[PDB]
């Protein structure tokens, strides 16, 4: 069992926080918010660094490039924006979605961006020019998450339509559709850090680990509450091998990845913990909550 303890509480956003992500170099934390702003924080001390402004409506998601020099953000204003973190400059504004943009990620080479939208499509963008390269008619309901695998050859997407799908990056072809017995909305998905599995959340209070090549669900993690919101989930690999997820009972849940037992719950937020992130080298967890709370909390552990 880990021993996560609250170290810092981060206030500054004036509306619901939508996403938190640690930079891959471990130095920074980025946060997005319905207040239309991105904020950067020191990852180890929680000290506020700067605000990045530009979107016209709330920001749903933010993600780092591999070298921690760029961010991409997805917004209700139907754009994505690519930011140079050091200068604060908006480098490109990606226009092409016909509805709110919900989720985004760079590929490992950080030469591409993938996005998912309420327009039920997944789009692939060129980082250097900012132009849309492919539009994939991915789903028949809003796209809840998009993520590249370890080498960037695949994209996984999830949707309220109940499907997880695996896409070939180069051709845009659907390679696999995954779904379990019930057809609950799929509210989050991502590849494992070694790229062999996908971790999928469904709006029936369930996280599932899938062998996607074999199309088999290996493990399930339960005990949290998730019936309404698209909540991030994470692999924690710096100490013990855990699963981390926020919850609609205002807690952060931590499971043992292999045995699936709950090993810790983290108490402190006053609203749905919509987003969590795991530091890439230290046993640090960032958690963020919705409109009744508006804060980000940083937790640290021995293992
Ligand atoms: C059919 O109706 C639906 C209803 C919902 C309900 N929305 C959410 O749950 C939700 C979840 C997150 C967390 N987040 C962000 C990216 N990723 C991958 C996440 N997991 C953020 C926000 C948000 C967006 C804009 C904003 F200004 C402020 C906030 C807090 C809303 C989702 C839906 O599918 C897309 C279809």
From Swiss-Prot:
Please list the GO biological process terms of this entry: gluconeogenesis; negative regulation of transcription by RNA polymerase II; positive regulation of DNA-templated transcription; positive regulation of gluconeogenesis; regulation of cell cycle; regulation of cell division; regulation of DNA-templated transcription; regulation of embryonic development
Molecular function via GO: histone binding; histone H3K4 methyltransferase activity; histone H3K4me1 reader activity; histone H3Q5ser reader activity
Keyword Transcription regulation set for record: yes
Location of the protein in the cell = Nucleus
User: Per the annotation, which location comes first and is thus the protein's main one?
Assistant: nucleus
The organism sits in which domain of life? Answer: Eukaryota
The identity of this protein, by name, is: WD repeat-containing protein 5
Q: Which PROSITE patterns match?
A: WD_REPEATS_1, WD_REPEATS_2, WD_REPEATS_REGION
> What does the UniProt function comment say about this protein?
Contributes to histone modification. May position the N-terminus of histone H3 for efficient trimethylation at 'Lys-4'. As part of the MLL1/MLL complex it is involved in methylation and dimethylation at 'Lys-4' of histone H3. H3 'Lys-4' methylation represents a specific tag for epigenetic transcriptional activation. As part of the NSL complex it may be involved in acetylation of nucleosomal histone H4 on several lysine residues. May regulate osteoblasts differentiation.
Tell me which species this is from.
Answer: Homo sapiens (Human)
Q: How does it assemble?
A: Interacts with PAXBP1; the interaction is direct and links a WDR5-containing histone methyltransferase complex to PAX7 and PAX3. Interacts with HCFC1. Component of the ATAC complex, a complex with histone acetyltransferase activity on histones H3 and H4. Component of the SET1 complex, at least composed of the catalytic subunit (SETD1A or SETD1B), WDR5, WDR82, RBBP5, ASH2L/ASH2, CXXC1/CFP1, HCFC1 and DPY30. Core component of several methyltransferase-containing complexes including MLL1/MLL, MLL2/3 (also named ASCOM complex) and MLL4/WBP7.
Q: Supply the InterPro entries for this chain.
A: G-protein_beta_WD-40_rep (IPR020472), WD40/YVTN_repeat-like_dom_sf (IPR015943), WD40_repeat_CS (IPR019775), WD40_repeat_dom_sf (IPR036322), WD40_rpt (IPR001680)
The record's Gene Ontology cellular component field reads:
ATAC complex; histone acetyltransferase complex; histone methyltransferase complex; mitotic spindle; MLL1 complex; MLL1/2 complex; MLL3/4 complex; NSL complex
């Amino acid at each position: 069992k880990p021993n996560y303890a609250l170290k810092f509480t981060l206030a500054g956003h004036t509306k619901a926080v939508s996403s938190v992500k640690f930079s891959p170099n471990g130095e920074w934390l980025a946060s997005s918010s319905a207040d239309k702003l991105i904020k950067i924080w020191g990852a180890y001390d929680g000290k506020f660094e700067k605000t990045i402004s530009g979107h016209k409506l709330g920001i749903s998601d933010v993600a780092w490039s591999s070298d921690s020099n760029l961010l991409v953000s997805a917004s209700d204003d139907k754009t994505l924006k690519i930011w140079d973190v050091s200068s604060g400059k908006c480098l490109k504004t990606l226009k092409g979605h016909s509805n709110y943009v919900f989720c985004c990620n760079f590929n490992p080479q950080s030469n591409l961006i993938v996005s998912g939208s309420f327009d039920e499509s997944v789009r692939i963008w060129d980082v250097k020019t900012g132009k849309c390269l492919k539009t994939l008619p991915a789903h028949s309901d809003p796209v809840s998450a998009v993520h590249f695998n370890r080498d960037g050859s695949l994209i996984v997407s999830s949707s309220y339509d109940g499907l997880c799908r695996i896409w070939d990056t180069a051709s845009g072809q659907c390679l696999k559709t995954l779904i379990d017995d019930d057809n609950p909305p799929v509210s989050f998905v991502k590849f494992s850090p070694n790229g062999k599995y996908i971790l999928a959340a469904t709006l029936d209070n369930t996280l599932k680990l899938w062998d996607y090549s074999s199309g088999k669900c290996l493990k399930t993690y339960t005990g949290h509450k998730n019936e309404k919101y698209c909540i991030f989930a994470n692999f924690s690999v710096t100490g013990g091998k855990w699963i981390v997820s926020g919850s609609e009972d205002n807690l952060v849940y931590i499971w043992n990845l292999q045995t699936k037992e709950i090993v810790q719950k983290l108490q402190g937020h006053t609203d749905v913990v919509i987003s969590t992130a795991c530091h890439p080298t230290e046993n640090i967890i960032a958690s963020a909550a919705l409109e009744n709370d508006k804060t980000i909390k940083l937790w640290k552990s021995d293992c």
